[PDB]
Structure formats: structure tokens, C-alpha cells
Symmetry: D8
């Protein structure tokens, strides 16, 4: 699918809504996808170091 | 405290892969890990610093 | 306003459409905003170094 | 080769500020500068490298 | 998949402080975040590399 | 108190028990405390950057 | 706001190659990109800092 | 050929003429060539990373 | 065996007992093992650089 | 000024290996080298800095 | 004045003439001025560190 | 092995200042120091590397 | 395995200061710590690498 | 005084005598003083960080 | 302003090799280049900084 | 041979004699050899980068 319902917490929601209020982002979804890319890149690196050594 | 988000199918696949690995328990835990990363990057950035020295 | 029409070039459009095809981004607009944030952060740094020295 | 993009008002203000400074000639030049940055960041990233070693 | 751990009172205070902040949901989420950090540090270390080249 | 019961997951438990098996650590608890110190130091840094700017 | 510059043939070839690639629209855009780089390098340098503390 | 006419803008011309006034450079052309070398080196790096991975 | 008696010095003992008092560590032994891991990692690196060049 | 410590067998093997190499004279010298490293890491850390600015 | 006669050596002259042959530079003088700026920036840094500490 | 070079007055002032300091003996020694720096920067650069892999 | 060394008075003062601090037990332990540093610096250096590729 | 008798160990003596044999150093004493300067600089740094924070 | 120095044969070979390369004119120029490096390293070091804050 | 007579300059001699006065060095010759090792290591690196690429 394309939609996901997530338990964020009140503080992290306040953070997301702040990034949207600033105007650097358009929707809460754009903030969440930006965060996912950060974790994805971090995860990819470690997995790259694993395939390389091997 | 629930949020509904448009991930698309590739980033949902990525999230469900990390949960599948077992280092995370729920999809929500993956999302919060990513937002903690984004909060730290935001607070550390030069833009946040430039925006505070308009005091 | 909120909409802007830009001359991109065929190659850079191909780049944008590739990032969307990968799924890491949803619309061409999300790609353009991500790029703007990079330049914005870069610009902010240099301006921060100017106010600091002064 | 034209594209229509939803910037929002703050990032349009930012672009028009850079053109106003004179280091850039058109709004389009600002957008292309940002996409060149994003292309370089993409090509250099660890994700692009991990994605190529599935050959 | 439950584990019982001796934290002492200061590191329990630290964990409960992070949950209190709201960036985490459960004490368990804090522990798993720390173990993910430790796993990444272990895999990246020079000791793990030296230990693999006894193949 | 001093004792805490945590939901780890089978994979992360396998990781802890591997570090103990190696001998670099004595108990599962020593592994968990080492991990907490890493996150604690990481958290302290960001909080230090906040008090400093202010 | 036009300037006439002696590039030589190799650096003209380089510029026209970058325009040919499509990441740039005009020769002028390439020149301005390079001058933006040079301005940033100048402002960041230790010489610019040493020259300001003769105030 | 060897000569090129470029639209610089009033501010970037002021920048070039400032570097010449300082004496670190002799002609506007020397400033422009120095800038080109910076972009050229930057471009070469990324292209080197492309041939290397491949 | 598993137990070792070591001449530490009064100052370094005061250091160990301070890390325990802080609560980040449980026993003097946990402090000593943490220190050993640091030296062990440092030693491993140099030995890795030796096998690699060779 | 003597301390009795539970090393386990692997870290005792490591210590006795370093003494065996000859760069160290006694097991105690290895332990003190490690504690000097830990003291330097502690003093340099961000936690020690954050803990001092509660003055 | 503006002109200086310098004892370079045959090898360093060969180096200068190579940078000119490549086309990245126009005259031997442009190469020498580029080198002077490098040493000048290096010298400025150390002198900046001296005024700062004081 | 002599070369005649157009320095301009500011970079001649800089050279004669370094000789005046005493860390250098002749103007020529300053010029050679700068060219050694430029040779090292050239050999180390990414352009020199990209230019060699057209073999 | 004893060596007699000319330290001069300032570096003897430095050594005896470190022993006085208590992080070291004997003057000899200070000397060996310094030689371990020098051995690591030597093995890691570019000179040691250049000298090995004359094989 | 100026002379010190130290227990080095056979391996570290072999190291010192190797650095002398290479010719980069003249006497065993020059090797020992070079090592002391390394530890001295390392010690000074940490002590500098202590006076600075305070 | 002349100094007589005990180099040993290997470091004399090294100096004469650099002069032979042509990047330097005299043995003295090599010695001064090395002393300029040592002066910069000394001024930049943490020891020089610690020694000044006893004012 | 083993002895070399060098034109240093009054300022660089003052520098050498200062390092000797501090006590970190014993003779002017020890200072000169320390400086040579710095340049030697710097030279070796660049030559290593040349053999490696080739």
C-alpha cells in the first residue's frame, strides 16, 4: 500500500508540525519521508561495509 | 497521538524490512528512529544557528 | 504564491524523474524542495560565518 | 524543458532572495544549482553504492 | 523474547528521562536504540575486522 | 530500583549473547549498560550544544 | 553587466563540455558557478580573517 | 577561440574587481580562470568517483 | 583463571571508584574491563594495519 | 594500593599476550595503560562537559 | 615595481611550463602568482593563530 | 635557469616581507617554496588522477 | 635489559612529574609508554610504507 | 641530574636500536627523548583541555 | 649566520637527494625548509599553548 | 661524511637555540635532525602516492 498509521508521540508530532510551519516542508508526510531517507542511508552504509569486507 | 502518513511502496518495504530484521519491534519504532535522526540533524545544522541569531 | 515554473533542461529532468521512480520521493516538487534545502543550508553557513566574525 | 513546481512561499522567498543578491540571474538558475548539489550528494552516497553492487 | 537487566539507579533514571521526554515510547525502545548503536560500533570496529581475517 | 525487564527481540538477544560468548563482557547486563552509555553520551552532546548556543 | 574574458582554448572546451552535459544552460552560468565557488573560498579563508583583524 | 563574453551581474563583477584591486590577481581574466579551475577540480572528482566505482 | 590482582596506585583507584560512584558502572571490575577493551581495540587496529600492508 | 579484578579468561589471555610481546613488563602495567586511556576518554567526553555546566 | 627575476631551476621551470601547456594557465607569471597565494594563505593562517592566542 | 615574472606590487611586498622575516634567504627561495606547494597540490589533486586514467 | 639515557633536566622533571601524579609507577613505565607511542607512530607513518615497497 | 637508567625490555631495545640503525637518529638517547616529547605533547593537550573548560 | 650540524650519513644522503631532484638549490635551503616546518609545528602544538597560559 | 655547515639566518638560529634552551632538545644538531625527519616524512608521502597510483 502507500499509507501508514504510526504512533509518534506528542513531542515528535510537535517537531513535525514545526518543520511544516517553517515552510521548508509541505506535509507531515514529507517530513516523515525525509527522516526515513536519513535512516535508510545510515542502514545502507553499514550493509555496504558488510558486503565489502566479505 | 497517531499520525497517518503517505510513505509510498518502496519506503514501506524498507520499513517492513527493518522490522523483519528484528532490530525494531513496530513500524512506529522505525518512524520514530528516523525522526530522532532528523531532529538531531536539524538542531545541529547551520540554518538553525543562523535562525537563532535573529534575537 | 506557491507555484514556480522553471527551465530545468532535459538531463536534470531525467534526474528528477529518476529519483521519483526510485520511490524515495513522491513528486517532482519534493525533489526540487529537497535540493533547495541543501543550497539553503549551504547559503546559511556562509552567512553565519559572516555574522560571527563580525 | 519546463517544469512547474510547488515551492510554498518560504522557499520561493529564499530563491528570490538569492536572485536579489545578484549571485544568480534567474529563479531557474537557483533551482538548477540546488539540483546539481542533490545529484552530487546522490552519486556520492552509500545508498547509491549499495544499490550498484546488486549487479 | 524478554530479558531482565541490572541497570542500577542512575542509568534507570537516564532511561526514564528519555521516555519522559517523549522521543521514545517504552523503556524497551531506549534499550534497543542503545543496542543498535552498540551493534553498529561493533561491526565497524577494527577488532571485528582483525577477528575476521583469521579465515 | 536496579532491575529492568525489557523486550529485546530474538536477534538483539543473539547479539548480546554473542558479545558475552566472545568474553569481552561478563553478563548480559554489562552489554546493556555499555549500550546505554553510548546513547547517554550521544544524548549529552546534543544537550550540550543546546546549552552552549543559549 | 557583460565582461569579456580570456579563457584560452582548454578552459573554453571545459565550459562548453559542462553546458553540453545539460547541468548548465549557458556558458555564463558556468562562469557564475565558478565565481560563487571562488567567493565562498575567499570569505572562508584564513587570509580574509587575518585581513579583517587590522581594524 | 580564446575570448568569451559573459553575463556576470553587477555584484559578481564587483567581487572580481575587488580581487584585482587587492593585488592578488592581475586581470579580471585571471580571477575567472581561477574560479574555473575550482569548478573543474570539483567536476573531475565526481567523475573520478564514477569511473572508479565502475 | 578469571581473577587478577593488580597494582593500580591510589589515584587510579580513586578514578575507578569515581566511575562506579557515578552509577555508569557497577563494579570496579566493569571499569577495568571497559579500559581493557579500549586498549584491545587500539592494539587490534595497529595489528590490522600490519596484516593489511603485508 | 592493590585491587582484585574479574577479567574472565579471554581478557586475561589478551593481557598476558601483551606482556608476552614485551612492550609491557607486568599485567599491572597493561591495566594502568587501559585506565589511562579510559581517564582520557572520560575527561574529553561530552558527558563530562555537560555534567560540569551544572555549577 | 612589478617584475621579478628568479632562479627557479630546470625542473621547476619544466613544472611551470607543463602547467601552461595544459592550458589551465596562460603565462608563467600566472603559475608563479598562484603558488605565491598558496604560501601567502599558509603564512596568514599561522599569523592568525598567533594574533588569536594573544 | 632564470625566469622573469610579473608579480605586481602587493605580492612583491609579500615576498620581500617573508625574506625580511629571515625564514628565507632570497626572493627566489620564496618563489621555489610556493612552487613546491603548487606541485604537491597538483600531484595530489583529483584532476591529476582523472587525467591519468585515460591510459 | 637496562638502558642508560641522557634525558637532560627538563625531561627528567617531566617524567618525575608524571610518576608523581600517580598514573605511572616507575620512571621506566613512563619511558616505555613513550616508546610505545613512538613505535605506533613509526609503523603508521608514510615513510615506513614507502620503505616497504622496495621489495 | 641528566642521566637515567631505565628497564626497557629486550623488544623495545631492539626497536630503539633499529631506529638508530636506520640513521634517522644518532643515539639511543635521541630516540628516548623523541618518544618523551610525544607523550609530553599528549599530556599537555589533556591538561590544556582541563584549564580551558575551567 | 652559519651553523655546523651532525646529520649522519643517511640524512645527508636524503638532503643531497632533494637538491639533486632540483626542487631545492642548496643543502641550506633544505635545512631551512625543515626548520620552517618545525617552527610551524611548534607554534601550532598544544604544548606551546599550555606553556603560554602560565602568564 | 656526517658533518654539514649550513646558512640558517639569524632568526632561525634563534629558533633552534630556543628549542635547546627549553630542554626538549640537547644540541642544535638534534633540532636540525628533527626538522629533517618532518620534511623526509612529508616527501615520502608524496612519493608513496606516486608509486601507488602507478
Amino acid at each position: 500500500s502507500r499509507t501508514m498509521t504510526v504512533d509518534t508521540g506528542e513531542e515528535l508530532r510537535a517537531f513535525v508540525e514545526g518543520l511544516v510551519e517553517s515552510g521548508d516542508y509541505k506535509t507531515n508526510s514529507e517530513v516523515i519521508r525525509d527522516g526515513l531517507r536519513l535512516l535508510q542511508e545510515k542502514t545502507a552504509g553499514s550493509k555496504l561495509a558488510a558486503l565489502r569486507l566479505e
